[PDB]
Amino acid sequence: LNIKTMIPGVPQIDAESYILIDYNSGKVLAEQNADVRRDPALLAHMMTSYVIGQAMKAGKFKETDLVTIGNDAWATGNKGASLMFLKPGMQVPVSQLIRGINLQDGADAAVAMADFAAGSQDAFVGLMNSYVNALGLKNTHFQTVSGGDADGQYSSARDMALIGQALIRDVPNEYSIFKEKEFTFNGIRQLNRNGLLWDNSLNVDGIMTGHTDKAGYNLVASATEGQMRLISAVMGGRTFKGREAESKKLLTWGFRFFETVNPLKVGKEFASEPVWFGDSDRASLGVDKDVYLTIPRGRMKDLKASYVLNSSELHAPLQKNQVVGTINFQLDGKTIEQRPLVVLQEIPEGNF
Ligand SMILES: [Cl-]
Ligand code: NA
């Protein structure tokens, strides 16, 4: 009812679905049909990139390793021109192939990497589906690594934003690939088709874009402003003209009306409480995971922190990171965010 306590209107987005989330807090800022199962088109390669990134993180291979191209990679919609051939017998560096997945149809480079990383396309696809389970995605399923007609291949705006968040969070060295405006594939210079990388009003460093007639226009974008990072997923975009415009509009809106606060870090003492029957007198209390809250912009000065304990008194023995209560964060008297209150240091039984 104030200009201070206002609820912002969401801009009109000419697309079938969308979601906008904060990367750190995972807070959902805006959504429409975010769980509707859709053709992801070329965004499916975000999951391809994710699995590849996990393989490299785990030291399975390196960007300098040479990959031989098979007949499997050649058979994808079968050189009559195109110096963009991944022809059989070639041995391409992993560096070229992981970037070539992002480029044009990633089909032949994705098929080559699938065999390299997982032995076969089917096994690799099994890995994409195990990570759908690991990431908790409820509306994503993969059928193929090449391109994406595939009638049993789908995702949603939310699930695609979550894949973008995991890419950034879990495999940042693979995520770095996405901001490169240009790279050389097979000796020929390519440009990044994420045009928002050239936007000087926004700091966008990801992620992927893809259009087909059945899937419409699709973009997953990530943008930063200081320490704040937003992720948008816009899918089933209706027009060419809005294919980057709609996502820009969403991203700028989330930065204008929301700010992400970090009230408390792992290991820092939020409160202390006395503990009975221990070797020590007081329990050091806080969190086991960094607290990130996304709140209305202008409100961070007004945010109030408090806590409640699971009990009347703390009794030893207390394990490190044992949950003993709840931290509540309030604005205007109402609790908007809660986190678990843990023991920061073990208090074994004793005397006291
Ligand atoms: Cl993993
Ligand atoms: Na590695």
Side-chain angles (χ1 to χ4, degrees):
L1 66 77
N2 276 268
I3 190 67
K4 290 288 290 175
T5 66
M6 52 155 263
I7 307 169
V10 204
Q12 199 69 17
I13 314 292
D14 199 16
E16 290 294 336
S17 70
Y18 72 81
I19 196 172
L20 177 68
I21 63 160
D22 179 271
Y23 162 82
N24 291 290
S25 72
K27 184 70 168 195
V28 185
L29 277 57
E31 54 182 297
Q32 202 84 286
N33 302 317
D35 299 293
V36 172
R37 293 174 176 187
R38 287 201 51 91
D39 194 340
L42 253 40
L43 303 184
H45 292 141
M46 275 164 63
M47 184 53 97
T48 304
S49 299
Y50 187 74
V51 177
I52 286 165
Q54 290 285 21
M56 313 199 46
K57 195 185 174 197
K60 294 300 284 281
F61 48 86
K62 359 218 301 189
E63 293 201 27
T64 39
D65 291 340
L66 293 173
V67 181
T68 307
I69 306 304
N71 304 290
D72 210 9
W74 191 243
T76 64
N78 204 287
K79 205 176 82 287
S82 291
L83 292 163
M84 352 259 35
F85 38 44
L86 280 185
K87 46 182 53 181
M90 278 187 162
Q91 302 150 41
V92 192
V94 166
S95 54
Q96 273 192 40
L97 295 186
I98 65 180
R99 288 169 169 79
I101 282 174
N102 196 5
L103 155 83
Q104 267 153 79
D105 68 90
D108 54 334
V111 160
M113 285 302 300
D115 292 348
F116 189 69
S120 74
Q121 300 187 59
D122 290 349
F124 189 88
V125 169
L127 288 186
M128 295 169 83
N129 289 322
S130 78
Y131 283 110
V132 161
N133 177 275
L135 290 175
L137 315 177
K138 308 168 184 84
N139 298 286
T140 300
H141 178 262
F142 301 106
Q143 163 176 325
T144 183
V145 298
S146 76
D149 185 285
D151 279 16
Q153 175 138 319
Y154 58 83
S155 196
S156 65
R158 183 189 319 274
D159 287 12
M160 279 297 145
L162 293 167
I163 293 175
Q165 176 186 46
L167 266 165
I168 304 172
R169 172 192 69 226
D170 302 328
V171 293
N173 288 320
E174 165 69 41
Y175 182 70
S176 298
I177 267 63
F178 298 115
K179 43 93 160 302
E180 307 180 356
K181 286 176 182 189
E182 19 210 321
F183 80 101
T184 290
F185 183 95
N186 230 119
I188 282 79
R189 175 203 31 181
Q190 315 284 356
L191 272 165
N192 206 307
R193 49 208 182 88
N194 182 7
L196 294 175
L197 296 167
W198 288 262
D199 200 291
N200 260 13
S201 63
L202 285 170
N203 191 21
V204 166
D205 60 18
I207 307 173
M208 282 207 177
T209 208
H211 168 84
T212 68
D213 290 316
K214 170 173 148 43
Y217 294 87
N218 301 279
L219 181 64
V220 180
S222 194
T224 59
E225 170 188 302
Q227 23 98 298
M228 187 178 176
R229 173 183 290 276
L230 298 186
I231 297 168
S232 62
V234 180
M235 293 175 63
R238 308 208 171 94
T239 72
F240 183 83
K241 260 39 185 289
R243 78 195 185 288
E244 287 162 359
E246 303 301 273
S247 293
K248 173 170 184 178
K249 189 160 58 171
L250 238 199
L251 282 167
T252 57
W253 174 89
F255 285 124
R256 183 154 88 252
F257 293 107
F258 298 84
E259 74 176 302
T260 297
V261 306
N262 185 214
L264 172 60
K265 302 168 183 49
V266 183
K268 312 310 173 86
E269 180 185 289
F270 173 68
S272 71
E273 283 286 335
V275 53
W276 293 77
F277 317 112
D279 57 348
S280 316
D281 244 326
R282 287 186 87 82
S284 192
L285 302 180
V287 295
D288 53 23
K289 191 168 162 294
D290 271 23
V291 184
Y292 285 102
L293 319 175
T294 302
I295 64 174
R297 192 168 294 277
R299 298 316 300 290
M300 86 85 44
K301 43 180 180 177
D302 291 321
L303 197 67
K304 307 306 169 192
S306 54
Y307 69 104
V308 172
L309 289 184
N310 289 5
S311 311
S312 343
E313 303 158 12
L314 279 171
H315 295 3
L318 285 174
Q319 302 192 11
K320 175 174 185 159
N321 292 322
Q322 181 181 331
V323 182
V324 292
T326 309
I327 316 187
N328 303 297
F329 300 86
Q330 287 187 10
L331 263 182
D332 306 321
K334 180 183 160 52
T335 293
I336 57 177
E337 294 296 331
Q338 308 167 290
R339 300 296 191 269
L341 186 70
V342 308
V343 187
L344 295 172
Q345 293 180 229
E346 170 144 29
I347 308 281
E349 254 187 287
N351 307 302
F352 294 94

